[PDB]
Amino acid sequence: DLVLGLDIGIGSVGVGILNKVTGEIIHKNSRIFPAAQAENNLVRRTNRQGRRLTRRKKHRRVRLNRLFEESGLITDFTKISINLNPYQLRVKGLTDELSNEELFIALKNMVKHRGISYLDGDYAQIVKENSKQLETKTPGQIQLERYQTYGQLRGDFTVEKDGKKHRLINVFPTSAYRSEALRILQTQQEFNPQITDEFINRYLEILTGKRKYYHGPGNEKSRTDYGRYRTSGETLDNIFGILIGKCTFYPDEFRAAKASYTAQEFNLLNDLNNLTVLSKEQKNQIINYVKNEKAMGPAKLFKYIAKLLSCDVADIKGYRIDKSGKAEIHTFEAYRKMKTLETLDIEQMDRETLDKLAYVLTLNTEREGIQEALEHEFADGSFSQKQVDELVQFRKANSSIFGKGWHNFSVKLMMELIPELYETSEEQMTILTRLGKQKTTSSSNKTKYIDEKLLTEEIYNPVVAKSVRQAIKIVNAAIKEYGDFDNIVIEMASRVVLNALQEHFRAHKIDTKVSVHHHAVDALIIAASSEDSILFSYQVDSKFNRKISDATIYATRQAKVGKDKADETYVLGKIKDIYTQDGYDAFMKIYKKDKSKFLMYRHDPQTFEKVIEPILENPFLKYKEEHGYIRKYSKKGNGPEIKSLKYYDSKLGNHIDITPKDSNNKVVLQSVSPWRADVYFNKTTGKYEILGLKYADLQFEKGTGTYKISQEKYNDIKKKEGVDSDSEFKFTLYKNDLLLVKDTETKEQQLFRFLSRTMPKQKHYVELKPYDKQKFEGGEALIKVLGNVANSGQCKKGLGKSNISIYKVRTDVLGNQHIIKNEGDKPKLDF
RNA sequence: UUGCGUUGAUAAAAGUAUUGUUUUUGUACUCUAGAAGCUACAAAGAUAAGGCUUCAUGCCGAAAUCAACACCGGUGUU
DNA sequence: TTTCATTTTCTGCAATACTTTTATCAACGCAA
DNA sequence: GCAGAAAATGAAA
């Protein structure tokens, strides 16, 4: 027999298999994986909600077009001018008549910009200032006056006053926009007859329509799995209600609300069973006294207990104590605060309907959720309208009683325990032990190996779950290839994996004691506390929908730059905020490199001399403190301000194209990300051909909607990347899929990790990463057919040379190599 | 191991707002009613490439899952 | 004798202000 | 950290 030791880091797990009787090393491995932290799901969720916002904004504008076309006002929306001022139109719309087109433009600009709606520190002060200025005048007048006096209204800006300054923001409450649109539409209804009251109703629905935070996305006919409408066919009416946890002894029932009747009964009965001096009659009497007396605290109930016992408060153990505080026990605070209603009584209703009413009032917060839950939950309830409105006002007034949370047990278990704790004096622990209910079962079937799923469901962090899953798969494969063990030592929360390992070794009668690169050697050290032959094994990344490129959008111009004698397309750049230190550094870089790369030096060169004078005399902050913003040259000092210039960055190369329909110049995206490669062989010339795909080449198909790459497009990539058609498809390679190259004249070989096919002009180049390390500090010497590594840290040597050979290797989880050389007749393009 | 009070941290999911980059148009600025599309400001369109059917409080797309192949939860090969 | 075809460097990358729910861990006490 | 063109090389013609 033998011993396994196992070291678990953040993003690497290493093994060591040792002998107890001799002291030999049997197997070592250093599996590496990316540590899945939670920045990527935050980026994914953030981008999904941003896409939803932009979607709904564009759909708001389309809904406004359909509203204006179905009421028969106008017909064509490609004739309307876009060179008016809408703010002036809104201010004129307060006073007199506008036509159909003018009103269309005014309401369109008003739909595009509604305001915040969470009202109904340094940011709240300024929107409060806009609200305090808003009381005399409508926000359209605020924006218009800010325009006519300062020339600039959009975004936050700092405006020079006579003694000080202030910062102005464009944020206003949406009730301002509601009142302003109401006054505008009422004046136009005085003047124009075609506006109906249903028109202003639907318009104020569009202008102030936000979905509630418990509705989610969806529709009756949409059926996404994110909102209350669901794919299976059941509409939830609140999405957070399906996320409520389960019981601890009946794992098919949800929890009970903490402000119900049975929860407060169970809590008071356990709290008075806890106390050390009671009988069944005194329990019933004390429960009736807490139920019927009004405005009591803990000390009043303790004085009533001391009256019923005729003894002083002395040697009374079992009272719950709060921090630096006197005795506090459970009172029927929720029941009594619902007894202070007047529209409906509580004392004679039921026990069932009080539990369901407390569930409804605990879950929903707003008016509509509470009203719809009262109408949909209560079969044969039939509440009246003033009862419902008093219930909503009661929930809104008391927000601490109904915002405590949910109990642990269900109503079944507590209703079972209640009649067995009136007679006896036992707490819930001894009653649930005596009755045998201790199951809380959760398991899954297996025969000979450990299952990762039922252990991994203990979630602390995703990184601990990922590391534990890789360790359990290693233990599985070592058990498969070596039979059984005699000791397993695991060194990294750890109590759950310890308990699962001991449970699996207890249930299958194995007597193996479970205990508590560089990591392989430290795993050997840990296995003792019970190299060239270090073999590695990486994790292959073959997911095909990651981030396709960068985010910035670029503009292109056709201009001769430098020592060129032809017209090519250059990609523009832009220095923003020329008065900052970084803008001045970038300006001096492009100035000392080549002054003709700016666009202000070609068109309107005279003002560049005006820009020449501050650099010749004195940064531009000195000129701003002297005289203000640098102006474009004019006869007077009426010149426009200068804050940003444009230059020519570089030529155009590999790109994605998003060019709009009416555009004189190509609009691109850059830095596109690669997916996998396809190594081909040419039999005539005797060389290899390395094709390469990117994420932006796969796309959704217009017929089905599936995710695949076509055949003609793949042959187009075959022609562009420069492979021959009568060639032999050898294999593919993903990220971190190992690769053995070998020349055929000395027969010396080396194996690397694939990374990416780079530099798409120069053909058959491969970026490749080391077998053991990942850094490549400096240039370490390689095989003589390949050369030396570049002195910056990147390696992008060239394949496709004559007298060389390329084989794929695959390692298993223990790291045993398997060298293969041909996989199929054709690559796979369906997943 | 189970329950009850406090107070911190995290994770999953939902609803909004104002910019930013970029395209067309207008006004100012420049040179001779035109030209140039630089420099400001204001409208309107796009905002990961892309895609669906139900015609709309419409919907999806940046995470995790992993050695492969062949013959009868197991079994063999390179 | 310039010109082209392969190997190395080196710069550059989207943000901010609110509202709400559910679950899980810790530690400080009362109980078996 | 990495996509990739710009500046720097070496081989021919």
PDB file of all heavy atoms in Angstrom, chain A residues 320-340:
ATOM      1  N   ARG A 320     -33.201  35.261  27.776  1.00  0.00           N
ATOM      2  CA  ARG A 320     -32.319  35.754  26.728  1.00  0.00           C
ATOM      3  C   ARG A 320     -31.887  37.183  27.024  1.00  0.00           C
ATOM      4  O   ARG A 320     -32.708  38.030  27.385  1.00  0.00           O
ATOM      5  CB  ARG A 320     -33.028  35.674  25.386  1.00  0.00           C
ATOM      6  CG  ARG A 320     -32.909  34.334  24.698  1.00  0.00           C
ATOM      7  CD  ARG A 320     -33.666  34.383  23.405  1.00  0.00           C
ATOM      8  NE  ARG A 320     -33.535  35.692  22.782  1.00  0.00           N
ATOM      9  CZ  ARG A 320     -34.411  36.183  21.919  1.00  0.00           C
ATOM     10  NH1 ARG A 320     -35.471  35.466  21.589  1.00  0.00           N
ATOM     11  NH2 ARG A 320     -34.233  37.387  21.398  1.00  0.00           N
ATOM     12  N   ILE A 321     -30.595  37.448  26.863  1.00  0.00           N
ATOM     13  CA  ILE A 321     -29.998  38.733  27.201  1.00  0.00           C
ATOM     14  C   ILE A 321     -29.388  39.364  25.952  1.00  0.00           C
ATOM     15  O   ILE A 321     -28.681  38.698  25.188  1.00  0.00           O
ATOM     16  CB  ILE A 321     -28.976  38.599  28.351  1.00  0.00           C
ATOM     17  CG1 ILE A 321     -28.423  39.968  28.758  1.00  0.00           C
ATOM     18  CG2 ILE A 321     -27.892  37.547  28.070  1.00  0.00           C
ATOM     19  CD1 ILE A 321     -27.663  39.958  30.061  1.00  0.00           C
ATOM     20  N   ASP A 322     -29.730  40.624  25.708  1.00  0.00           N
ATOM     21  CA  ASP A 322     -29.127  41.404  24.639  1.00  0.00           C
ATOM     22  C   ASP A 322     -27.884  42.110  25.163  1.00  0.00           C
ATOM     23  O   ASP A 322     -27.670  42.201  26.375  1.00  0.00           O
ATOM     24  CB  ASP A 322     -30.114  42.434  24.092  1.00  0.00           C
ATOM     25  CG  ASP A 322     -31.373  41.803  23.555  1.00  0.00           C
ATOM     26  OD1 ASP A 322     -31.621  40.618  23.862  1.00  0.00           O
ATOM     27  OD2 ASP A 322     -32.112  42.490  22.822  1.00  0.00           O
ATOM     28  N   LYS A 323     -27.039  42.568  24.232  1.00  0.00           N
ATOM     29  CA  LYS A 323     -25.725  43.088  24.598  1.00  0.00           C
ATOM     30  C   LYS A 323     -25.857  44.381  25.406  1.00  0.00           C
ATOM     31  O   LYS A 323     -26.563  45.315  25.003  1.00  0.00           O
ATOM     32  CB  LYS A 323     -24.832  43.266  23.356  1.00  0.00           C
ATOM     33  CG  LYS A 323     -25.164  44.377  22.352  1.00  0.00           C
ATOM     34  CD  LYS A 323     -23.989  44.637  21.416  1.00  0.00           C
ATOM     35  CE  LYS A 323     -23.921  43.641  20.271  1.00  0.00           C
ATOM     36  NZ  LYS A 323     -25.032  43.835  19.311  1.00  0.00           N
ATOM     37  N   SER A 324     -25.219  44.380  26.589  1.00  0.00           N
ATOM     38  CA  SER A 324     -25.258  45.467  27.580  1.00  0.00           C
ATOM     39  C   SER A 324     -26.690  45.898  27.903  1.00  0.00           C
ATOM     40  O   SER A 324     -26.987  47.083  28.053  1.00  0.00           O
ATOM     41  CB  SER A 324     -24.419  46.659  27.117  1.00  0.00           C
ATOM     42  OG  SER A 324     -25.096  47.413  26.128  1.00  0.00           O
ATOM     43  N   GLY A 325     -27.586  44.917  28.005  1.00  0.00           N
ATOM     44  CA  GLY A 325     -28.998  45.203  28.133  1.00  0.00           C
ATOM     45  C   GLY A 325     -29.693  44.223  29.055  1.00  0.00           C
ATOM     46  O   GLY A 325     -29.172  43.156  29.388  1.00  0.00           O
ATOM     47  N   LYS A 326     -30.893  44.618  29.464  1.00  0.00           N
ATOM     48  CA  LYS A 326     -31.745  43.826  30.334  1.00  0.00           C
ATOM     49  C   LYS A 326     -32.430  42.709  29.552  1.00  0.00           C
ATOM     50  O   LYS A 326     -32.270  42.571  28.336  1.00  0.00           O
ATOM     51  CB  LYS A 326     -32.779  44.714  31.029  1.00  0.00           C
ATOM     52  CG  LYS A 326     -32.220  45.982  31.677  1.00  0.00           C
ATOM     53  CD  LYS A 326     -31.031  45.690  32.595  1.00  0.00           C
ATOM     54  CE  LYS A 326     -30.149  46.912  32.767  1.00  0.00           C
ATOM     55  NZ  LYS A 326     -29.511  47.304  31.483  1.00  0.00           N
ATOM     56  N   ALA A 327     -33.154  41.871  30.298  1.00  0.00           N
ATOM     57  CA  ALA A 327     -33.854  40.713  29.752  1.00  0.00           C
ATOM     58  C   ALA A 327     -34.880  41.102  28.692  1.00  0.00           C
ATOM     59  O   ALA A 327     -35.656  42.044  28.874  1.00  0.00           O
ATOM     60  CB  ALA A 327     -34.549  39.966  30.886  1.00  0.00           C
ATOM     61  N   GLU A 328     -34.870  40.376  27.573  1.00  0.00           N
ATOM     62  CA  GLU A 328     -35.816  40.597  26.487  1.00  0.00           C
ATOM     63  C   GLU A 328     -36.304  39.243  25.996  1.00  0.00           C
ATOM     64  O   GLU A 328     -35.496  38.337  25.775  1.00  0.00           O
ATOM     65  CB  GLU A 328     -35.165  41.433  25.367  1.00  0.00           C
ATOM     66  CG  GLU A 328     -35.845  41.491  23.982  1.00  0.00           C
ATOM     67  CD  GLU A 328     -35.526  40.317  23.067  1.00  0.00           C
ATOM     68  OE1 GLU A 328     -34.471  39.679  23.264  1.00  0.00           O
ATOM     69  OE2 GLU A 328     -36.330  40.039  22.152  1.00  0.00           O
ATOM     70  N   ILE A 329     -37.623  39.105  25.843  1.00  0.00           N
ATOM     71  CA  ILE A 329     -38.256  37.865  25.411  1.00  0.00           C
ATOM     72  C   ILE A 329     -39.250  38.175  24.300  1.00  0.00           C
ATOM     73  O   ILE A 329     -39.577  39.329  24.031  1.00  0.00           O
ATOM     74  CB  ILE A 329     -38.952  37.118  26.566  1.00  0.00           C
ATOM     75  CG1 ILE A 329     -39.877  38.059  27.334  1.00  0.00           C
ATOM     76  CG2 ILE A 329     -37.931  36.477  27.475  1.00  0.00           C
ATOM     77  CD1 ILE A 329     -40.659  37.371  28.422  1.00  0.00           C
ATOM     78  N   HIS A 330     -39.729  37.117  23.654  1.00  0.00           N
ATOM     79  CA  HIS A 330     -40.619  37.260  22.512  1.00  0.00           C
ATOM     80  C   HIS A 330     -42.025  37.640  22.946  1.00  0.00           C
ATOM     81  O   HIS A 330     -42.638  36.959  23.769  1.00  0.00           O
ATOM     82  CB  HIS A 330     -40.683  35.962  21.713  1.00  0.00           C
ATOM     83  CG  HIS A 330     -39.582  35.811  20.714  1.00  0.00           C
ATOM     84  ND1 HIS A 330     -39.576  36.478  19.510  1.00  0.00           N
ATOM     85  CD2 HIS A 330     -38.472  35.041  20.725  1.00  0.00           C
ATOM     86  CE1 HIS A 330     -38.493  36.144  18.832  1.00  0.00           C
ATOM     87  NE2 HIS A 330     -37.807  35.272  19.547  1.00  0.00           N
ATOM     88  N   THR A 331     -42.533  38.728  22.385  1.00  0.00           N
ATOM     89  CA  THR A 331     -43.911  39.157  22.554  1.00  0.00           C
ATOM     90  C   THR A 331     -44.611  39.082  21.204  1.00  0.00           C
ATOM     91  O   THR A 331     -43.969  39.058  20.153  1.00  0.00           O
ATOM     92  CB  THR A 331     -43.989  40.577  23.125  1.00  0.00           C
ATOM     93  OG1 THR A 331     -43.318  41.486  22.246  1.00  0.00           O
ATOM     94  CG2 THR A 331     -43.326  40.637  24.485  1.00  0.00           C
ATOM     95  N   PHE A 332     -45.942  39.054  21.226  1.00  0.00           N
ATOM     96  CA  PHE A 332     -46.725  39.012  19.989  1.00  0.00           C
ATOM     97  C   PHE A 332     -46.851  40.408  19.374  1.00  0.00           C
ATOM     98  O   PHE A 332     -47.944  40.942  19.207  1.00  0.00           O
ATOM     99  CB  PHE A 332     -48.109  38.431  20.248  1.00  0.00           C
ATOM    100  CG  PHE A 332     -48.165  36.931  20.313  1.00  0.00           C
ATOM    101  CD1 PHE A 332     -47.364  36.208  21.179  1.00  0.00           C
ATOM    102  CD2 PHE A 332     -49.070  36.244  19.525  1.00  0.00           C
ATOM    103  CE1 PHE A 332     -47.445  34.834  21.232  1.00  0.00           C
ATOM    104  CE2 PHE A 332     -49.155  34.874  19.578  1.00  0.00           C
ATOM    105  CZ  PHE A 332     -48.343  34.169  20.431  1.00  0.00           C
ATOM    106  N   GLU A 333     -45.700  40.989  19.021  1.00  0.00           N
ATOM    107  CA  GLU A 333     -45.656  42.355  18.501  1.00  0.00           C
ATOM    108  C   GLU A 333     -46.369  42.487  17.155  1.00  0.00           C
ATOM    109  O   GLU A 333     -47.076  43.475  16.921  1.00  0.00           O
ATOM    110  CB  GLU A 333     -44.203  42.839  18.459  1.00  0.00           C
ATOM    111  CG  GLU A 333     -43.249  42.041  17.596  1.00  0.00           C
ATOM    112  CD  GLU A 333     -41.815  42.500  17.745  1.00  0.00           C
ATOM    113  OE1 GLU A 333     -41.597  43.623  18.248  1.00  0.00           O
ATOM    114  OE2 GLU A 333     -40.903  41.736  17.364  1.00  0.00           O
ATOM    115  N   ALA A 334     -46.207  41.504  16.267  1.00  0.00           N
ATOM    116  CA  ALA A 334     -46.846  41.562  14.955  1.00  0.00           C
ATOM    117  C   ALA A 334     -48.358  41.405  15.069  1.00  0.00           C
ATOM    118  O   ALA A 334     -49.117  42.142  14.429  1.00  0.00           O
ATOM    119  CB  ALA A 334     -46.261  40.490  14.041  1.00  0.00           C
ATOM    120  N   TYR A 335     -48.806  40.403  15.834  1.00  0.00           N
ATOM    121  CA  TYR A 335     -50.231  40.179  16.069  1.00  0.00           C
ATOM    122  C   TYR A 335     -50.903  41.387  16.720  1.00  0.00           C
ATOM    123  O   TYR A 335     -52.002  41.785  16.317  1.00  0.00           O
ATOM    124  CB  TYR A 335     -50.410  38.931  16.935  1.00  0.00           C
ATOM    125  CG  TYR A 335     -51.838  38.566  17.266  1.00  0.00           C
ATOM    126  CD1 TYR A 335     -52.612  37.834  16.378  1.00  0.00           C
ATOM    127  CD2 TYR A 335     -52.404  38.932  18.480  1.00  0.00           C
ATOM    128  CE1 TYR A 335     -53.915  37.491  16.681  1.00  0.00           C
ATOM    129  CE2 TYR A 335     -53.704  38.600  18.788  1.00  0.00           C
ATOM    130  CZ  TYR A 335     -54.455  37.877  17.888  1.00  0.00           C
ATOM    131  OH  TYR A 335     -55.750  37.542  18.204  1.00  0.00           O
ATOM    132  N   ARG A 336     -50.257  41.985  17.725  1.00  0.00           N
ATOM    133  CA  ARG A 336     -50.841  43.147  18.386  1.00  0.00           C
ATOM    134  C   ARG A 336     -50.847  44.366  17.477  1.00  0.00           C
ATOM    135  O   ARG A 336     -51.797  45.153  17.502  1.00  0.00           O
ATOM    136  CB  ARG A 336     -50.099  43.454  19.684  1.00  0.00           C
ATOM    137  CG  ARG A 336     -50.327  42.435  20.777  1.00  0.00           C
ATOM    138  CD  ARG A 336     -49.839  42.942  22.114  1.00  0.00           C
ATOM    139  NE  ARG A 336     -48.405  42.762  22.308  1.00  0.00           N
ATOM    140  CZ  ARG A 336     -47.505  43.727  22.155  1.00  0.00           C
ATOM    141  NH1 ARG A 336     -47.889  44.942  21.796  1.00  0.00           N
ATOM    142  NH2 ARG A 336     -46.220  43.478  22.362  1.00  0.00           N
ATOM    143  N   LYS A 337     -49.799  44.550  16.670  1.00  0.00           N
ATOM    144  CA  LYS A 337     -49.800  45.679  15.750  1.00  0.00           C
ATOM    145  C   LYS A 337     -50.777  45.489  14.600  1.00  0.00           C
ATOM    146  O   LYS A 337     -51.213  46.480  14.009  1.00  0.00           O
ATOM    147  CB  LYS A 337     -48.391  45.938  15.228  1.00  0.00           C
ATOM    148  CG  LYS A 337     -47.527  46.698  16.212  1.00  0.00           C
ATOM    149  CD  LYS A 337     -48.200  47.995  16.625  1.00  0.00           C
ATOM    150  CE  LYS A 337     -47.253  48.902  17.385  1.00  0.00           C
ATOM    151  NZ  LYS A 337     -47.899  50.203  17.700  1.00  0.00           N
ATOM    152  N   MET A 338     -51.132  44.250  14.271  1.00  0.00           N
ATOM    153  CA  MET A 338     -52.244  44.038  13.357  1.00  0.00           C
ATOM    154  C   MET A 338     -53.585  44.060  14.070  1.00  0.00           C
ATOM    155  O   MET A 338     -54.623  44.061  13.400  1.00  0.00           O
ATOM    156  CB  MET A 338     -52.095  42.711  12.613  1.00  0.00           C
ATOM    157  CG  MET A 338     -50.951  42.659  11.631  1.00  0.00           C
ATOM    158  SD  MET A 338     -50.427  40.986  11.228  1.00  0.00           S
ATOM    159  CE  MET A 338     -51.857  40.411  10.331  1.00  0.00           C
ATOM    160  N   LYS A 339     -53.590  44.053  15.404  1.00  0.00           N
ATOM    161  CA  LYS A 339     -54.832  44.227  16.150  1.00  0.00           C
ATOM    162  C   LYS A 339     -55.264  45.687  16.213  1.00  0.00           C
ATOM    163  O   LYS A 339     -56.456  45.962  16.391  1.00  0.00           O
ATOM    164  CB  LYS A 339     -54.685  43.638  17.559  1.00  0.00           C
ATOM    165  CG  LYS A 339     -55.996  43.378  18.294  1.00  0.00           C
ATOM    166  CD  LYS A 339     -55.931  42.120  19.142  1.00  0.00           C
ATOM    167  CE  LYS A 339     -55.179  42.359  20.437  1.00  0.00           C
ATOM    168  NZ  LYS A 339     -55.847  43.375  21.287  1.00  0.00           N
ATOM    169  N   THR A 340     -54.337  46.625  16.016  1.00  0.00           N
ATOM    170  CA  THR A 340     -54.650  48.047  15.980  1.00  0.00           C
ATOM    171  C   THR A 340     -55.170  48.518  14.628  1.00  0.00           C
ATOM    172  O   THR A 340     -55.096  49.716  14.338  1.00  0.00           O
ATOM    173  CB  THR A 340     -53.421  48.875  16.362  1.00  0.00           C
ATOM    174  OG1 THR A 340     -52.477  48.854  15.286  1.00  0.00           O
ATOM    175  CG2 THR A 340     -52.773  48.323  17.617  1.00  0.00           C
TER     176      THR A 340
END
